[PDB]
């Protein structure tokens, strides 16, 4: 399938070259997979979600996304126009308040919630969790992400926006999850993207157009935007039967575009997420 005039990041993930604007992908489109977006919530009523998004948990007075960040990330996972996996089921877990902040204890509870809640959902092709969040190093936060991954969920986490080594941030520094850095439309490391040995993969993260609250759209930048590209890609590849939750990060790294990014520091992988779809 071909989506013309797609956001640059979608075009990038199905291309061996930067500078194109059509997204190519298998029509299965993540059907039968599920992606949890652990964030500020999701505006499930947005027409871009086509009824495929729902809130399943909040730790606050509302499950509504009063911020926009979670809606944007969910849109990159699975919205009809802005999403990688256009037929996946999206589940919102609101661990971040409407200012975008959340206590680590609430974030940990949200991860353990997903590990159990997947047993209440129909996801025959597999389960992914997208975590566009993080703070300073915490062994307990890393351990929660490790448990979620161990439970059979492909966990994708943002590397962080400190232009520094991700070893000092969590859950970015957890070895067993998929830590995602950000690139721009010219295949440069995004100027804010963290780096280091713990990174597994880069995805599009600078000037990413997606859904926003109020039934709107907007373009924003961050490793928070790269993460859902990888989460959606994992769901898409699991639906195709090409990988599993336990091995999807390594498979994405195996099949990535290699050596094509600039300003990647020595010792950080030079790997850009790629669907290898042959139309």
- The rounded distance, in Å, linking the Cα atoms of 14 and 136 is 33
**Cα angle, residue 204 at apex, residues 194 and 118 outer, rounded to 5°:** 90
Phi, psi values for residue 210, rounded to 5°: -160, -175
DSSP state of 161: S
Separation between Cα atoms, residue 130 and residue 85, nearest integer Å: 13
Dist CA 220 CA 111 (whole Å)? 25
Measured distance between the N- and C-terminal CA atoms of the chain, rounded to whole angstroms: 7
Pick the CATH number of 2-272 from 3.40.50.200, 3.30.470.10, 1.10.287.3510, 3.30.300.180: 3.40.50.200
Judge whether 40 is annotated as a binding position.
no
* Token code pair at residue 131: 């975590």
Buried b (16+ CB within 10 A) or exposed e, 150-169: ebebbbbbbbbbbeebbeeb
Q: How many residues does the chain have?
A: 279
Please name the residue that has the structure tokens 């373009």.
219
Q: What span, in angstroms and rounded, lies between the C-alpha atoms of 14 and 20? A: 10
C-alpha 113/C-alpha 107 separation (Å) is 10
Output the six-digit token pair for 47.
């027409």
Q: What share of the chain is helix, strand, coil (3-state, %, to 5)?
A: 25, 25, 50
Q: Find out whether 204 is annotated in a ligand binding site.
A: no
**Residue 156, beta-bridge partner list:** 130, 178
Closest CA to 243 of 273, 207, 212, 279: 273
Sheet holding 126-131, edge to edge: 53-58, 89-94, 33-39, 126-131, 154-158, 178-183, 201-204, 271-272, 257-258
Rounded Cα–Cα distance for residues 279 and 274 (Å): 14
DSSP helix/strand/coil, 229: helix
Q: Per the annotation, does 200 bind a ligand?
A: yes
Of 260, 193, 188, which Cα lies nearest the Cα of 224? 193
Cα–Cα distance for residue pair 149/213, rounded to 1 Å: 30
Residue 178 CA to residue 2 CA, distance in Å, equals: 28
Rounded CA gap, 150 and 256, in Å? Answer: 24
Give the Cα separation of 39 and 145 in Å (integer).
Answer: 14
Angle CA(22)–CA(77)–CA(60) in degrees, nearest 5?
A: 150
Contacts of 272 (CB under 8 A, 6+ apart): 12, 183, 187, 201, 202, 203, 256, 257, 258, 260, 261
Alpha carbon distance 106, 19 (integer Å): 41
For residues 76 and 130, give the distance between their C-alpha atoms in angstroms, rounded to a whole number.
Answer: 11
The answer to the question of whether 117 is labelled as a binding residue is no
Phi and psi angles of residue 242, each rounded to the nearest 5 degrees, phi first: -85, -20
d(CA 108, CA 231): 19
**217 marked ligand binding residue:** no
| Number of other residues whose CB lies within 10 A of the CB of residue 79 | 26
- Catalytic residue annotation: 39, 69, 224
């Amino acid at each position: 399938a071909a989506q013309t005039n797609a956001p640059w990041g979608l075009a990038r993930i199905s291309s061996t070259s930067p500078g194109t604007s059509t997204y190519y992908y298998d029509e299965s489109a993540g059907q039968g997979s599920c992606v949890y977006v652990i964030d500020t919530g999701i505006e499930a009523s947005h027409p871009e979600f086509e009824g495929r998004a729902q809130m399943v948990k909040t730790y606050y007075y509302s499950s509504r996304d009063g911020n926009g960040h979670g809606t944007h990330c969910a849109g990159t996972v699975g919205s009809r126009t802005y999403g990688v996996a256009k037929k996946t089921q999206l589940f919102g877990v609101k661990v971040l308040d409407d200012n975008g902040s959340g206590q680590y204890s609430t974030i940990i509870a949200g991860m353990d919630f997903v590990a159990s809640d997947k047993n209440n959902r129909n996801c025959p092709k597999g389960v992914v969790a997208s975590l566009s969040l993080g703070g300073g190093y915490s062994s307990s936060v890393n351990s929660a992400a490790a448990r979620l991954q161990s439970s059979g969920v492909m966990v994708a986490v943002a590397a962080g926006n400190n232009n520094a080594d991700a070893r000092n941030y969590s859950p970015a520094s957890e070895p067993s999850v998929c830590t995602v850095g950000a690139s721009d439309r010219y295949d440069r490391r995004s100027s804010f993207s963290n780096y280091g040995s713990v990174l597994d993969i880069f995805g599009p993260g600078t000037d990413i157009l997606s859904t926003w609250i109020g039934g709107s759209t907007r373009s924003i930048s961050g490793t928070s935007m790269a993460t859902p590209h990888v989460a959606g890609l994992a769901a898409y590849l699991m639906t195709l039967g090409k990988t599993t939750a336990a091995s999807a990060c390594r498979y994405i790294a195996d099949t990535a575009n290699k050596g094509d990014l600039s300003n990647i520091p020595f010792g950080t992988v030079n790997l850009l997420a790629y669907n290898n779809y042959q139309a």
